[PDB]
């Protein structure tokens, strides 16, 4: 039974792996998908602003005896250090064979169950030369859910799928650069860019040893760096696994935040549908909800939820945007690739677009929003005032 | 020599006329590389037409009228010859070279028509020069009239439809419905289009990646499934390459699959063609003027490859994949031409004119 | 025990058992079970246990109609059961068994009745993969070679398996992409489709490409079949919208590649579709061969009006 | 007129047991027949016209013995340089060039068919099209005909450096290692009026600037799987196997296939044949044995010797009982009393 651990402004009084992604917390995401490929017990390794996750996690559906990945959550003040955390794994000695590791915000429908063939009898037949699979998506540059930050330059090796080198182009150089030792043995060199990181990992138990000696090592682009350059008396390899059916993310920037919850919104996740474990689907996809009163004249356009409890009033235009449960927007509202959440309350003439809200919080009359803007935990914005770009209040 | 050829698999019974090719390159391996007497210039275009390398139902005409007017700039006139006669019997096996390529084509016939009426009008005591540069020249002022000039000012007519609120259909690419469909929105007039595009060689994504640039909205839909835009459509300019005098619309494969299943909710079917590209034939069904092409393509890599590559290997499976369709005047409305709106059933009255 | 709660996910991540009576085998094991051993009053606790656990099992996916079908099917057979009652266990377990026996032979009888029909010499033409009609059309090969035009539509497409399944064991097959039929089906008689599930009314719910398919029949005038046994007969008249279908995810129909052009453009893939009974012209079935219009009075020999 | 076709002549360049007058050209065969005809029978084979030859005066007595369709070269290539490496191949017969040119200059033998690699030219209009066979590394995309970076371990560091906008365009390139290069070169015209002005660029493998496609003319080559080798290196005795007479006193007491001997030569008894070619006008008379090795014209060894595949060089000569295993026995000079090892006869 693979065990498959989960480590764990606005995000410091909440958690950044309880922030809801619509209308449900990303800590039951990385439940879902670890419940689908196949997990008998987990284990959630606690780190900041914790035992909240102990009572969130205690109190949804995964905490009952009729469950299948029967967790055992983990809380530890000491290793506030977000590396080596592996170390009191195999320190507290948990783990029997073939973790599979994946930190956090993991919104993903990927099936596993295809790839652990491909690691784990290629890994007997080398007997010892494997370490790890890294899965990883394809797609195509240009996409918005590449970020400026994130690129890989990952060239493997042809009809072995070994990851030789290694980049991470992140400091964005105008000219990318592999090492001559790799093209220098001769099989076939093929240097792929088109990859995007799924951030999910299915190790060998040995790659918990691997990190008690050798421990200064932290990052997962760390270890990956460490193991295939230096260790050069026959370390291991690196075999990745592509894809070309669902993805999951990980995206933890808010500029990742506005596609990868806009587009688990548009079904890109098809078991991972809004209607999950209420609400109702439309056409042009305004996935409306329950015990909720639209007012006359209103269009709800395209791409919409709108959750338990609101009411939105007369003349209001809300367009591609989310919609927490038990707001109440006003007369002539304007909403616009927003997003609300649990319990705000904006006024009457509004021109809210490309911005967010957070939980709790007001607004009152010609309060007119600008790109990008992003208020926070019950602020309110008041009387009659236009805030610029990024005008980031507290 | 011309040895062309090279038909391969069993056609699908009933029709035996139409001659199936492969895409293996065919006749490349044949010709000599000197120059091949053959084509001086045709072998190139020749070459890039069966690879599928220009493909538009537009723009064949350009390209052959582009060759042709290089060859045309490059004629000899031998000593005992009036060059009439025979650069216009010179000219015969090379468009049959080309038409050996794939089926003839669609109404590019009409440029060649008119190539020979305009070779056949040379005067008969000039310089070479003279009637070369000015053959060269008319050859030139045609595309500039019919192809180039026309295209603009049948544009302006359609602006006069395709007013606020509707919802455009167009399906897969067309050479004209993105000109006076995107001419439309410079100059304002909000809509939202949807395409719809089919199964092999999807077409669609043309339209759907040159539209985005223009900044109107989209949507997208296979054929097999077009039975949800039509609760909301308001329109479809389904705009097509061949008129034919009693009333027919020689399409892309998928049209006539979706006019008439249009009008079984009620909403209107526009076709928009060009002043040239009607012809004089008459056809009545699809299965005499057809033309297939290549039944390697449909290979869904859909999981375990269910066999594509295997049906040769077995007995009595043909796949066919037509290319051209059929669209009777009692499911068509107005014809949006460069000489007016006129009605479909005016179609031979454009002829005499 | 809660395994039904297993099956009760089993329905809810997807994983067809490709509808061979497999969805009725296990919803007549597990309503067999609940009906075995359970809470026991006199006064239809049982059928209130048949309510919840129903509509518990009704809020699966709402496509596989034929769990809710036998569902209701089970309730009829318990109030026919009282209504003689006026020891039930016995009868209603006995009864059941016998529906299920009943239940074993479908794909059988329903294909005996073929040589009354397909003649020699005749194009005829279906659409999408189904076991019924690839069962039905292999017992008419003791007769003369026909053709038969597959479409290749639906995409994904679950539909050419069967062109090989057919053409190496019989009659000469060709297949053609769906955006081809109209070309064809001016060349063609006896159109058959398989059915998803068919409504009070005289609807088929089915494949993403039978409407656009029959409308051709009916412009043609050439009949169609859709041979479907029985126990798919479902209430409800289509009232409820749009949950009328199976939304899947856009990669199906457009590649997560080509980017950007991603960002703003909208992609619908609809699984089924809906055919109205004006179109339909027979209806082959598994105990006799029903018109359209008679098909309402065979659903109140079936059901009881608890039909919510 | 589609394409003209230039032959020249390069010169030496590293050949010791050709440096003398052994190769007074490149017609000094390991083959059959000369070398330029192996290659020059291939554009005659294909069906082009009278082609343009450069060499320096020395082919130039070999004009009037060679046959083929026409020819009409220039052997006033005045070899005070021993360069123009298409510099001055191509700049000094510019102005009779008139139109396109593909160009395989004095060069290796080829087994493969041009009809793909001029109609991957002739399809696209592309500017360059060049073979290949399967360290100086050279990458190409998911496809044929995908030309990215082509660069020697020359100006290289220690490292490779990935031009970043060929990298977000094509989004795969995979470099192939190692390949044979070959010298079938098919250019644009224009490509020749470039490098007319501006001649500071030379030499053949340096006019590779356009793998500076960034920053339009695009470059495209193909690859194979086929017997197409190279033959100007030490190693034309590997290419001695070409198997593509009768005019000789063939005394057929040795009983041997596969090998070929020249015509007007005498055969020998109480001998045998074992993959080993054989020069014309050479005497084989008593005892002898054949060796898999390469033998020129006008020499003779008979009389109990017994040869393993070294380079009988033309002007030679064998007697007494020989056993040599592997050796360059140099030309003009001549051994019969010896057991020799593997070291080359000098002049």
Redesign the interface.
Known sequence: PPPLQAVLPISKDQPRVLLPLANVALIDYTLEFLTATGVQETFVFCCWKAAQIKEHLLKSKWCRPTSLNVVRIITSELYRSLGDVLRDVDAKALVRSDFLLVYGDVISNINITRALEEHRLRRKLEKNVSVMTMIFKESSPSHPTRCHEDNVVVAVDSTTNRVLHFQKTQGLRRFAFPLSLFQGSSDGVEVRYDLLDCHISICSPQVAQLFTDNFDYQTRDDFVRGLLVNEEILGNQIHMHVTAKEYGARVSNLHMYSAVCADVIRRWVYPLTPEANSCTHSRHNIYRGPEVSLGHGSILEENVLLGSGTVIGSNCFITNSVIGPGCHIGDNVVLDQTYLWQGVRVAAGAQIHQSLLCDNAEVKERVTLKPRSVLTSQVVVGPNITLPEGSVIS | QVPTRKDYGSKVSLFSHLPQYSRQNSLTQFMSIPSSVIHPAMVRLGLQYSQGLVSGSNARCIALLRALQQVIQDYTTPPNEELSRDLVNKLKPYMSFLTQCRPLSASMHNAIKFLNKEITSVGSSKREEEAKSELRAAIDRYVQEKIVLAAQAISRFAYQKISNGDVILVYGCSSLVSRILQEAWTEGRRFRVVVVDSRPWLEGRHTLRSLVHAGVPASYLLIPAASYVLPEVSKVLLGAHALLANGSVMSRVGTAQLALVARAHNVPVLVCCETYKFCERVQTDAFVSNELDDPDDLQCKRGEHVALANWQNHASLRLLNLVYDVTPPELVDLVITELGMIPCSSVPVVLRV | SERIESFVETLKRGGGPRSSEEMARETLGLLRQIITDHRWSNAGELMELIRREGRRMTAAQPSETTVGNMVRRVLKIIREEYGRLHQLQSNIIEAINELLVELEGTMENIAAQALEHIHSNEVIMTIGFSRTVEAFLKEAARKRKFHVIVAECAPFCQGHEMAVNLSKAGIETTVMTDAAIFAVMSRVNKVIIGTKTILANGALRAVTGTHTLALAAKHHSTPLIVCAPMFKLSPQFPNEEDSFHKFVAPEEVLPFTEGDILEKVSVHCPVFDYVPPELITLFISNIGGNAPSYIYRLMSELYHPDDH | ???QAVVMAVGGGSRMTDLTSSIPKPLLPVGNKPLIWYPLNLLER????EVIVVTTRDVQKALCAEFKMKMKPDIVCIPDDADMGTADSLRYIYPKLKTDVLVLSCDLITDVA??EV??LF??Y?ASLAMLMRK?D?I?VDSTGKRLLFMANEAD?????????SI??KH????????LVDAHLYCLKKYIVDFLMENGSITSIRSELIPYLVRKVHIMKEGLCSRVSTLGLYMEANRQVPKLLSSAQIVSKHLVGVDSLIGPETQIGEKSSIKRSVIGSSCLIKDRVTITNCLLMNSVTVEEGSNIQGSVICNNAVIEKGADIKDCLIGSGQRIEAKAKRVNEVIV
């Open positions: 007129m589609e394409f294909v069906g082009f016209e041009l009809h001029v109609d002739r399809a209009d360290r590394f990458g290289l560091d220690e490292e490779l450096v990935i031009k970043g990298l977000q989004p795969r390139i995979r470099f192939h290692t190692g």
